[PDB]
Amino acid sequence: DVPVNLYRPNAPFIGKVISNEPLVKEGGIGIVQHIKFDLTGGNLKYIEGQSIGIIPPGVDKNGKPEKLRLYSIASTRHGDDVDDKTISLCVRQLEYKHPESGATVYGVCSTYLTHIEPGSEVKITGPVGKEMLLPDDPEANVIMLATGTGIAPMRTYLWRMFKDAERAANPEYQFKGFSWLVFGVPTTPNILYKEELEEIQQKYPDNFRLTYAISREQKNPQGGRMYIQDRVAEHADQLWQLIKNQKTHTYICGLRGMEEGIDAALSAAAAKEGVTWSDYQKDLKKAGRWHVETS
Numbered sequence: 001d002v003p004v005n006l007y008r009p010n011a012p013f014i015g016k017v018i019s020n021e022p023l024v025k026e027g028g029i030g031i032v033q034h035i036k037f038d039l040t041g042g043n044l045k046y047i048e049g050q051s052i053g054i055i056p057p058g059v060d061k062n063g064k065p066e067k068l069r070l071y072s073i074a075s076t077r078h079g080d081d082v083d084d085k086t087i088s089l090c091v092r093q094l095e096y097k098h099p100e101s102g103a104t105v106y107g108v109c110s111t112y113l114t115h116i117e118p119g120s121e122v123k124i125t126g127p128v129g130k131e132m133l134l135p136d137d138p139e140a141n142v143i144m145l146a147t148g149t150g151i152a153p154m155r156t157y158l159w160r161m162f163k164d165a166e167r168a169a170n171p172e173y174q175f176k177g178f179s180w181l182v183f184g185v186p187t188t189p190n191i192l193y194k195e196e197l198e199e200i201q202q203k204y205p206d207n208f209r210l211t212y213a214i215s216r217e218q219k220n221p222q223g224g225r226m227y228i229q230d231r232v233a234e235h236a237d238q239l240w241q242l243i244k245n246q247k248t249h250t251y252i253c254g255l256r257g258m259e260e261g262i263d264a265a266l267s268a269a270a271a272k273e274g275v276t277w278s279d280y281q282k283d284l285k286k287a288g289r290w291h292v293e294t295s
């Protein structure tokens with residue numbers, strides 16, 4: 001049922017870029033682009049939470065062809081236009097200062113993508129992944145913890161759940177549970193899809209909660225910059241109480257250094273009721289209700 005590897009690296013699907021739009025507003029840090037590709041002419045199908053690979057042109061320092069890089073799909077299975085004809089990505093241009101050099105280094109595939117022009121042909125593979133799938137149960141509770149581009153799979157869940165056109169297209173999935181997104185980014189201008197996320201909260205106040213952790217505009221109780229683990233700590237009991245429901249699913253996507261703080265917070269909450277979080281968590285993973293995707 002779940003589509004996987006309809007296209008592989010040795011024979012990728014060649015899709016055409018339809019649009020490449022900026023997501024970081026003025027005054028924000030870095031570049032993050034929402035890129036939409038045309039899937040017509042191929043049979044690439046996918047579902048929420050999956051990823052696709054992108055093979056950039058060129059060779060590496062050793063003269064070897066560039067390998068694919070994975071990107072979390074940012075659109076629902078129907079595409080942003082709900083026409084089953086496209087797929088979108090949320091790509092940050094990777095750039096860092098070279099060790100003891102000061103010179104900025106630019107990621108190969110992400111620079112290629114963020115600067116790509118509409119009409120360009122791109123090699124796509126996939127889809128891949130069965131670790132971040134959304135429950136078919138419309139009554140489920142969905143906790144979403146994300147940082148930066150980790151918002152990608154969350155957008156696919158939230159759009160399917162709350163977009164008017166999606167609800168009209170998915171008679172089998174009329175969401176009426178509770179979803180809570182805790183999103184961490186450095187600045188307000190960096191809140192990806194801010195306008196749309198807030199529109200959902202306004203229209204579905206009883207079904208969607210939105211919490212931000214803005215590091216350059218907020219500080220935690222300790223005086224440090226506000227990060228996602230700080231928000232989880234702040235609402236640890238509320239989160240634990242929700243997680244206890246057998247119908248609750250939790251999704252974590254973003255940097256590889258966020259789970260540690262998250263676990264510390266939930267561990268203290270569960271310990272109050274004589275529960276060892278590490279063990280409970282293991283059981284949640286085994287049951288397919290604790291979804292993590294970081295790097």
Ligand SMILES: Cc1cc2nc3c(=O)[nH]c(=O)nc-3n(C[C@H](O)[C@H](O)[C@H](O)COP(=O)(O)OP(=O)(O)OC[C@H]3O[C@@H](n4cnc5c(N)ncnc54)[C@H](O)[C@@H]3O)c2cc1C
Pocket residue numbers: 051069070071072073090091092093094096106107108109110111149150152293295
């Ligand atoms: C399952 C999955 C989903 C992903 N989803 C997304 C997504 O939705 N959006 C997105 O933008 N990215 C996503 N990524 C990351 C993506 O796959 C690429 O790794 C990213 O875009 C960088 O690739 P690049 O080709 O631009 O950089 P490359 O040319 O491949 O350079 C990367 C290399 O630079 C070095 N490096 C990286 N960071 C630093 C640093 N901070 N300091 C010093 N050295 C460093 C490392 O040696 C690294 O191997 C995802 C990754 C995976 C595994």
Ligand SMILES: NC(=O)c1ccc[n+]([C@@H]2O[C@H](COP(=O)([O-])OP(=O)(O)OC[C@H]3O[C@@H](n4cnc5c(N)ncnc54)[C@H](OP(=O)(O)O)[C@@H]3O)[C@@H](O)[C@H]2O)c1
Pocket residue numbers: 072092147148149150152184185186190215216225227228229253254255256257258293294295
């Ligand atoms: N499938 C996957 O494995 C998957 C999928 C999608 C994304 N990703 C990963 O997620 C990352 C997205 O990064 P981005 O560039 O989009 O992020 P970003 O916009 O630069 O920032 C995200 C926020 O996280 C903060 N942060 C730093 N260390 C943290 C920690 N240990 N715990 C929690 N927050 C921390 C940052 O701090 P400051 O404000 O102080 O800078 C910032 O506010 C990528 O590196 C990508 O590899 C992985």
